[PDB]
């Protein structure tokens, strides 16, 4: 089973570090269990959205490949994957004992809070992912690599460098699988099942976008509105 090359070991070091550097309190100790849909639920959530969006922006910037694209491309790639990444980042922090996700490394939310907080069915999707990601035992390199795959998505509307972006994603995909091969998880068909999680995360990002077409806008943090 092919294990990672040396150029790939360096790409794994690059992405892991950029992720660790932009991941809140890498946190179970520094927790804060929170208590038609109440805009009072919005307050706690929209107030924590901007610091989360920013961390994704910071992860992106710390990948050279990302910095080599034209700004209008960087904007489109960040719009398209921000919720996908914030969502992976909460899902790997699912605690089966409390049945909670940890947002921003501190706030512990439940299925019910996130849903009635305005996320709706997307809440069930993210909890379901976290539950099903428990047995995967993804480490910081695996998560960072999933993030780079979502970030470097060639099919986002308006992109100029479709060909370059695709070439970068192929790169991360090969490092990711060779690292997966190296790690020998005690789970069957590990690589296939991960690619299925990537589709689960991309459904979360497409449904969030669609659910943001709801009526005022000034009530919503300004960076949240700029990443729909």
């Amino acid at each position: 089973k092919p294990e990672p090359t040396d150029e790939e070991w360096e790409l794994i070091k690059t992405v892991t570090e950029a992720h660790v550097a932009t991941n809140a309190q890498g946190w179970k100790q520094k927790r804060k269990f929170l208590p038609k849909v109440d805009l009072e639920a919005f307050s706690h959530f929209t107030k924590i959205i901007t610091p989360a969006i920013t961390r994704v922006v910071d992860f992106a910037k710390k990948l050279p490949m990302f910095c080599e694209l034209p700004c209008e491309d960087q904007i489109i790639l960040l719009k398209g994957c921000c919720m996908e990444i914030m969502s992976l980042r909460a899902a790997v922090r699912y605690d089966p004992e409390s049945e909670t996700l940890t947002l921003n490394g501190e706030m512990a939310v439940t299925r019910g809070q996130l849903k009635n907080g305005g996320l709706g069915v997307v809440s069930d999707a993210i909890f379901d992912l976290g539950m099903s990601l428990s047995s995967f035992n993804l480490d910081d390199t695996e998560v960072a690599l999933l993030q780079a795959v979502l970030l470097m998505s060639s099919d986002r509307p308006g992109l100029a460098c479709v060909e370059r972006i695709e070439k970068y994603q192929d790169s991360f995909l090969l490092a990711f699988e060779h690292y997966i091969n190296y790690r020998k998880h005690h789970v069957t068909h590990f690589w296939p099942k991960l690619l299925m999680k990537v589709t689960d995360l991309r459904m979360i990002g497409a449904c969030h976008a669609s659910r943001f077409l709801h009526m005022p806008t000034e009530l919503f943090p300004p960076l949240f509105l700029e990443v729909f």
């Binding site: 920013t54 910037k61 700004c71 904007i75 960040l78 960076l223 990443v227």
Partner: peptide
């Protein structure tokens, strides 16, 4: 129009 994003990306 992606003014805050644009800022956070150039800085």
């Amino acid at each position: 129009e992606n003014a805050l994003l644009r800022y956070l990306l150039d800085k």
